[PDB]
Design a protein around this ligand. Structure first.
Ligand code: NA
Lengths: 282, 294
């Protein structure tokens, strides 16, 4: 069975949380997901294999902090440098250098390719859920655990969250009454996350959520506001954001996109991000 | 003051040491308890919030509304998000949802439902007469005092008790109590909040009391969101209920809000208007609240 984390792990502050292994002082990242009084344990134990990939935060264990008056704690490796969303927020002009966006986007795609190959959909790709280590490595938070929880109807799948990263196919309407979706929905999210890095927020961020939900299936694909960006960047965004998912490139195709595939300054970019992380952290 | 955005220092304080989490607080000058919802805000969020305060209407205290005491900013260091405090009268006897959950069988007698529903409509009438829409009527946002008073949640610019599932103004929320007109759908491109949306939610809340859950509780939220504008209005599953109750439900849940009754008309509906056992009901509610604290 799954334990209560007391005396094993404790929450420090939020970043997903900074958590601490109580007995050893080792740090961990803790994804807190409310849950309903078993088979949670089972899925985690199937999926945890997958978290070993370098671009996914490795699973440490899982715990539930009971109870009515429940909460799942997904414990994973600590990424000291915080989320890419915090990075952009703490960056002047709320925008990252294009070649930083190329590096980070590729790392996200490598992590996703790993899940997708094994028929896992992440379902929650956004800047908030992509973390950085001190050495500026890029790791996805979660690896299908929250995806499985969003499946079950019940008292802990009663809310619709933010719509800004949702692909068109995820949003029901009369020609799409069953909100049919697959792994390619994660790639639309990656595109939205790339804009997030470029502009500081996803498109439609200033719109009422309900209205954004209405506009996504009906508006053309979002584009970068500014023309300062390269043709290759615009092209990468276009690929992530193919309106009809049936024609959207897969993860392996996007990994071959010139924006992603050709990064002659990688070593330097990592060095720049590392320094930027230091200068900008709060 | 319900129109300025001050530091809460020396006006309100937390007594009990999460985003949108509600804490027990205290009015500094009078010692009167309060419920304090605390939220991180960026600098930009602070401008948005100032604007929403200008948009707020003026209305008096009301026995069926948990008094909104105002909005405040708790300063954090430069580079760090400040805190928004939304301050409300303290109601210590839980929500109507807690009430249902603590009732054996998770269901309420019909005369309890009439009583509570009436109190809800009275709060709503006060808001509506003042050109205010509540926007979030559900069992969770209707509170009890230790005196068994029924009070609508009012955090001013926010209408919910539980912690916001995401950053303010960025999440869709739970769809179950939403009227059709507030759901953007193929035929409703401009999601209408109208005062009558609260009356639909009121109807849903009465089913919530009668059955323990809102209609469509067996659907994933996104599927429910799709269904609500498309389905005919929901109904009570059981036939055990009085004709009056069925008629009240049907009154609240008129599909087209333009053809749905006003609060004043619903307050005259026999199910609401004729409560021969209300004195007993209140007594019964108070005993229930007493038993529970034990
Ligand atoms: Na890993």
């Amino acid at each position: 069975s799954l334990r209560d984390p007391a005396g094993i792990f404790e929450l420090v502050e939020v970043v997903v949380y900074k958590g601490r292994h109580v007995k050893t002082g080792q740090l961990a990242a803790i994804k807190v997901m409310d849950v309903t009084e078993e088979e949670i344990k089972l899925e985690i134990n199937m999926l945890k294999k997958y978290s070993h990939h370098r671009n996914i935060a490795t699973y440490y264990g899982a715990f539930i902090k009971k109870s009515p008056p429940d909460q799942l704690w997904l414990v994973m490796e600590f990424c000291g440098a915080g989320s890419i969303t915090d990075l952009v927020k703490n960056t002047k002009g709320n925008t990252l250098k294009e070649d930083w966006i190329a590096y980070i986007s590729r790392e996200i795609l490598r992590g996703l390719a790993h899940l997708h190959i094994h028929h896992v959909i992440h379902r929650d790709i956004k800047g908030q859920n992509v973390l950085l280590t001190e050495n500026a490595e890029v790791k996805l938070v979660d690896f299908g655990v929250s995806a499985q929880l969003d499946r079950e109807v019940g008292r802990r799948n009663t809310f619709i969250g933010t719509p800004y990263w949702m692909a068109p196919e995820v949003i029901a309407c009369d020609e799409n009454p069953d909100a049919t979706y697959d792994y390619r929905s994660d790639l639309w999210s990656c595109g939205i996350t790339a804009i997030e890095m470029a502009e500081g927020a996803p498109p439609l961020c200033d719109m009422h959520p309900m209205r954004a939900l209405f506009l996504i299936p009906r508006n053309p694909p979002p584009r970068l506001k500014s023309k300062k960006w390269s043709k290759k960047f615009f092209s990468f965004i276009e690929g992530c954001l193919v309106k009809n998912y049936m024609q959207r490139p897969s993860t392996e195709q996007l990994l071959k996109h010139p924006f992603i595939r050709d990064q002659p300054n990688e070593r330097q970019v990592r060095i720049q991000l590392k320094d930027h992380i230091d200068r900008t952290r709060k």
